[PDB]
Amino acid sequence: RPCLVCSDEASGCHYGVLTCEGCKAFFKRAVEGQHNYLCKYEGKCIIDKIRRKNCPACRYRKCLQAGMNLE
Amino acid sequence: ARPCLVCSDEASGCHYGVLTCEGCKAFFKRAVEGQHNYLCKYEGKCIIDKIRRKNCPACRYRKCLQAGMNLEAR
DNA sequence: TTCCAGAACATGTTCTGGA
DNA sequence: TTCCAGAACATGTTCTGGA
Ligand SMILES: [Zn+2]
Ligand SMILES: [Zn+2]
Ligand SMILES: [Zn+2]
Ligand SMILES: [Zn+2]
Numbered sequence: 470r471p472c473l474v475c476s477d478e479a480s481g482c483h484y485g486v487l488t489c490e491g492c493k494a495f496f497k498r499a500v501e502g503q504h505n506y507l508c509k510y511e512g513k514c515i516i517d518k519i520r521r522k523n524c525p526a527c528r529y530r531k532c533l534q535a536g537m538n539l540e
Numbered sequence: 541a542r543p544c545l546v547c548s549d550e551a552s553g554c555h556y557g558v559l560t561c562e563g564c565k566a567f568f569k570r571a572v573e574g575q576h577n578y579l580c581k582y583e584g585k586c587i588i589d590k591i592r593r594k595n596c597p598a599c600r601y602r603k604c605l606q607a608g609m610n611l612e613a614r
Numbered sequence: 615t616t617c618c619a620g621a622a623c624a625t626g627t628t629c630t631g632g633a
Numbered sequence: 634t635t636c637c638a639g640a641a642c643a644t645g646t647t648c649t650g651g652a
Contacts, residue, residue: 494644
């Protein structure tokens with residue numbers, strides 16, 4: 470039911486983890502190309518359905534921590 | 541200024557002649573320029589607001605034109 | 615039947631040049 | 634000082650091949 474990365478509604482098991490579509494799409498883009506990833510506030514950003522956009526670097530670390538994997 | 545003329549989200553300015561949010565501004569540009577084939581899946585009278593503007597891009601674009609938006613404007 | 619990765623499709627946010 | 638168009642950047646959602 471809940472996305473392990475942002476607590477939004479999970480659509481299913483993506484890349485090894487239960488996530489929503491946004492996190493599924495964000496993760497793949499994160500590992501492939503990227504998007505500026507180095508936090509300012511510094512690794513303590515609250516990643517939820519409403520503030521996930523606020524910090525791209527914290528979102529990804531949480532994707533990794535959650536154990537999402539392409540391979 | 542105040543609310544978006546199209547969806548009522550907070551407007552960021554006058555874009556293409558009308559007071560719109562940034563989402564509606566980018567949406568209008570794509571509606572006029574891209575290859576689309578819009579037709580309301582319902583009765584062509586959907587309520588377009590912040591949480592629902594994604595539900596029917598056909599009526600959203602109709603609202604944009606209605607409200608006077610036009611690529612030939614500031 | 616039921617599932618998901620990725621492509622295809624759709625949407626939203628920041629930046630700032632040249633007024 | 635302030636404004637916006639569009640480029641560049643960033644994000645989210647549908648669809649379905651091939652299991
Ligand atoms: Zn998520
Ligand atoms: Zn952060
Ligand atoms: Zn709007
Ligand atoms: Zn409609």
